Design a protein around this nucleic acid. Structure first.
Ligand SMILES: [Mg+2]
Ligand SMILES: [Mg+2]
Ligand SMILES: [Mg+2]
Ligand SMILES: [Mg+2]
Ligand SMILES: [Mg+2]
Ligand SMILES: [Mg+2]
Ligand SMILES: [Mg+2]
Ligand SMILES: [Mg+2]
Ligand SMILES: [Mg+2]
Ligand SMILES: [Mg+2]
Ligand SMILES: [Mg+2]
Ligand SMILES: [Mg+2]
Ligand SMILES: [Mg+2]
Ligand SMILES: [Mg+2]
Ligand SMILES: [Mg+2]
Ligand SMILES: [Mg+2]
Lengths: 39, 115
RNA sequence: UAUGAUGUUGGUUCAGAUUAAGCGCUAAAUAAGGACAUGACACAUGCGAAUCAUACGUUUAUUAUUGAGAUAAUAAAUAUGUGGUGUAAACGUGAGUAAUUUUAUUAGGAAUUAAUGAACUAUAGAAUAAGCUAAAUACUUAAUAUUAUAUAAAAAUAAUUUAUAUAAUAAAAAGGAUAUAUAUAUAUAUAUUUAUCUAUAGUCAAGCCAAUAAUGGUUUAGGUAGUAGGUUUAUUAAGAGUUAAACCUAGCCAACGAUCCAUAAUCGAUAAUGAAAGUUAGAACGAUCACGUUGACUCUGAAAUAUAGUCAAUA
RNA sequence: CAUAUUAUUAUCUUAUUAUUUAUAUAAUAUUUUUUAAUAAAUAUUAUUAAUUUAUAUUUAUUUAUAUCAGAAAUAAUAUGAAUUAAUGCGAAGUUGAA
């Protein structure tokens, strides 16, 4: 069923994008606003 | 009357007392809808005259207000006047006898232009 | 109108104008303006879109010539046969619609909208041959008649415009009515009329996008995966995840209220009201949109998911 | 617990339609190879109707995708409900002493 395959493709793309966003949140090197860099 | 653009009369006023609006309008649109332009007004009822004035020699006058320069523009473009508008404009001198019809002698009073 | 009385806060009600009005009682004449807001509920019956005989066919009557008919001239009949034009308007309605295409406004834009004229104006030209229809102005087949290139020029220039020369443009048509003039009833040739086709421009028109505004509920707080953006391809006259295909990026909206739900046609130089800002209505006058029992699609066409056609649903 | 209508779908069914596949001694036009019937002239030679043949325009058949509408599932928007929660009023009072 082309509808089922299309839905699976859409789902795969969507979960890829959510994983990308979640890992992009922690992609930024977050320094310590109090104590600056580690060293 | 033919073509898309036609110079016609749109009925304004009240029941039993018509006045008319000389308009340039689409053929396919309603008679009383807002037209392309409003060239003038025409009050059909003649001005009443006193019995004395009939003897003195004046005649009833029918009031037409018209934009002469603009009506020339619309006639030039090919707007097709209607039968009543043809009669009105032909008396005004705007239209010559080329617009006369077979259905339609002496001249008591020749057309005169004054300020 | 509190209070035993005072001052203040505070609500409730009243005085004013009005209506798309209803009802109770009452009622003379005339002039003008309106009149199913509710069940976009269902409908008996009659009407609301016909017209052209000068497109083609038929059918008669008389006269003339010919011998049951044939051919002409003149009179008619024929819209139950073939055709042209008209029903995309107007009329009515307010169901849908909170905007994904709706409304209002801008001295707003481009994709820098088509070799579109729809139906008139002003100009030129052309109107050929066959077939099929019983015949044709019905249909087919065929003949003839801006864009893309390349060269330059400029500037309103980092493109557009101009001119030139090519390429294809290359896409048509239809005769009727009268007269006459030839000749040999037959053709033919002019004129007058009314049509037909192409081309330039004018007018009237269309399609698309932008900015601002357009009810209530967050006791609807997260929503969105074509979703947000990029690149190509098809489609269109034309931009764009508008629709279909493919490949990339991870975005976009949101407590200045998204998404969802409910409700609603919108507006004015219209109506009501107020001192005014405003508030209300959207009946009547006018402007825009949507629909014509419900949903989807198709032909024609410039423009239609048409009050058309097909299919389905309801009766 | 019960009725109703919109909305959707990894589901079932599908009118019609749009593309899209494949197949037609399937048709119609033209182009061949051919067979009969008919005409003219001294063996014909061409003609129409049929036989085979390969380009278009469609028909039937099918492959796929989408699709009005129907079910089935879910959700909401409503309408009713035994059972049930709270509170408002008033009648003259009854009971506490907050
Ligand atoms: Mg008191
Ligand atoms: Mg009245
Ligand atoms: Mg109504
Ligand atoms: Mg006739
Ligand atoms: Mg007929
Ligand atoms: Mg309409
Ligand atoms: Mg024709
Ligand atoms: Mg989208
Ligand atoms: Mg509504
Ligand atoms: Mg409102
Ligand atoms: Mg409405
Ligand atoms: Mg109104
Ligand atoms: Mg009304
Ligand atoms: Mg409609
Ligand atoms: Mg009805
Ligand atoms: Mg409908």
């Amino acid at each position: 069923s082309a509808k089922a395959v299309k839905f699976l493709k859409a789902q795969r793309r969507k979960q890829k994008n959510e994983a990308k966003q979640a890992t992009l949140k922690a992609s930024t090197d977050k320094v310590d606003p109090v104590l600056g860099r580690a060293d | 009357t033919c073509g898309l653009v036609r110079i016609r009369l749109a009925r304004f006023g009240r029941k039993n007392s018509p006045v008319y609006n000389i308009v340039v309008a689409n053929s396919r649109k309603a008679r009383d809808a807002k037209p392309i332009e409003v060239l003038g007004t025409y009050v059909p009822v003649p001005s009443p005259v006193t019995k004395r004035e009939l003897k003195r020699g004046v005649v009833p006058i029918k009031d037409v207000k018209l934009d002469f320069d603009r009506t020339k523009y619309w006639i030039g473009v090919g707007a097709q006047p209607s039968e009543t508008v043809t009669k009105l404009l032909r008396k005004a001198g705007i239209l010559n006898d080329a617009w006369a019809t077979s259905k339609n002698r002496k001249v008591v009073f020749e057309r005169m232009e004054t300020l």
